[PDB]
Design a binder for this molecule. Sequence first.
Ligand SMILES: O=P(O)(O)CP(=O)(O)O[C@@H]1[C@@H](OP(=O)(O)O)[C@H](OP(=O)(O)CP(=O)(O)O)[C@H](OP(=O)(O)O)[C@H](OP(=O)(O)O)[C@H]1OP(=O)(O)O
Ligand SMILES: Nc1ncnc2c1ncn2[C@@H]1O[C@H](COP(=O)(O)OP(=O)(O)O)[C@@H](O)[C@H]1O
Ligand SMILES: [Mg+2]
Ligand SMILES: [Mg+2]
Ligand SMILES: [Mg+2]
Ligand SMILES: [Mg+2]
Ligand SMILES: [Mg+2]
Length: 318
Amino acid sequence: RQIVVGICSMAKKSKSKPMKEILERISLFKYITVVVFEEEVILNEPVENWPLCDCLISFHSKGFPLDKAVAYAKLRNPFVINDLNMQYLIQDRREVYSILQAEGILLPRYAILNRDPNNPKECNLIEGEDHVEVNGEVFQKPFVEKPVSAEDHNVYIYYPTSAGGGSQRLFRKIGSRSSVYSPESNVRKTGSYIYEEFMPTDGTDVKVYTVGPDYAHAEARKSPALDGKVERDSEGKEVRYPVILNAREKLIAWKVCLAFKQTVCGFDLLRANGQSYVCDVNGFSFVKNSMKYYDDCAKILGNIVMRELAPQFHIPWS
Ligand SMILES: O=P(O)(O)CP(=O)(O)O[C@@H]1[C@@H](OP(=O)(O)O)[C@H](OP(=O)(O)CP(=O)(O)O)[C@H](OP(=O)(O)O)[C@H](OP(=O)(O)O)[C@H]1OP(=O)(O)O
Ligand SMILES: Nc1ncnc2c1ncn2[C@@H]1O[C@H](COP(=O)(O)OP(=O)(O)O)[C@@H](O)[C@H]1O
Ligand SMILES: [Mg+2]
Ligand SMILES: [Mg+2]
Ligand SMILES: [Mg+2]
Ligand SMILES: [Mg+2]
Ligand SMILES: [Mg+2]
């Protein structure tokens, strides 16, 4: 009997180039068969009708019925690569930051402003022209304002008077741009936000991609917060810069992977003030346009599957 690896995610993810490149490589494992769950089945069929698997790779993105994935895993009890219940928490920046703190992982100093939907101005935010006070905690500009929903990428940065004031409004890339300047200096007045201290980097973000706690690919890209113009290469892809993680950062990746129980895990690091701060944990994410990552990721995942399941299948594995 072949060991079945089931892939359960939205078609946009399951049919992405990185996914296809990696699944083709996992399929090279002699005793592993890959089954990709059709999106129509995921959305419209009860979990009792979903394909069987022995190892489940499943992850939430927009429109994914996480409730069904959880029910499926409870019904079939497969070996789960990326924990499903943790994926509820990953959708909430407050829950993400709570986990990071609990694990002794450096992150920006932050405060949560929750607005009870029924009451607009019954909250504890005091605003000055160059600072905010959130539940009594002071944040001098520059500071960062993030929607509590991790799926909401409308992150704002507020400039001090000394730099001309106003704000930088980040958003999901639309064409050539990832942010825009706004003359608006006052914070958003509806919704719930995390406020945090701006960490000064060299103008790049470090993107980290784990495959288990002992493997992490990192690369850097221009921070959207600089001017907002996306750097693109001749082929039209966003420019990336080489990164090698130092010992502290490799430990960070180990902690993030295990703490969130996401074997495959993407997160952001800000290299600032001689340290590295996690500002975002996204969960399941593959590196794009790296053949070597495809090779490495497929090999590691296949090895994890074999290590875990080969005994019960009576397959030799050393
Ligand atoms: O390159 P194109 O414009 O064709 C697509 P884009 O580059 O916007 O891809 C983003 C990706 O952004 P990044 O460039 O890796 O920062 C996201 O990554 P971020 O979460 O922004 C990683 P970051 O937080 O910037 O480090 C995440 O990609 P993935 O990681 O899920 O593959 C998104 O997927 P989703 O969040 O919309 O489901 C995906 O958007 P989509 O492909 O759906 O249009
Ligand atoms: N505390 C911070 N200090 C400086 N820059 C930040 C901070 N938080 C976020 N940023 C910048 O804003 C970008 C988006 O923030 P992030 O928390 O990664 O949100 P998203 O989940 O939308 O990716 C980051 O890639 C980084 O460039
Ligand atoms: Mg095979
Ligand atoms: Mg995601
Ligand atoms: Mg992004
Ligand atoms: Mg991010
Ligand atoms: Mg994010």
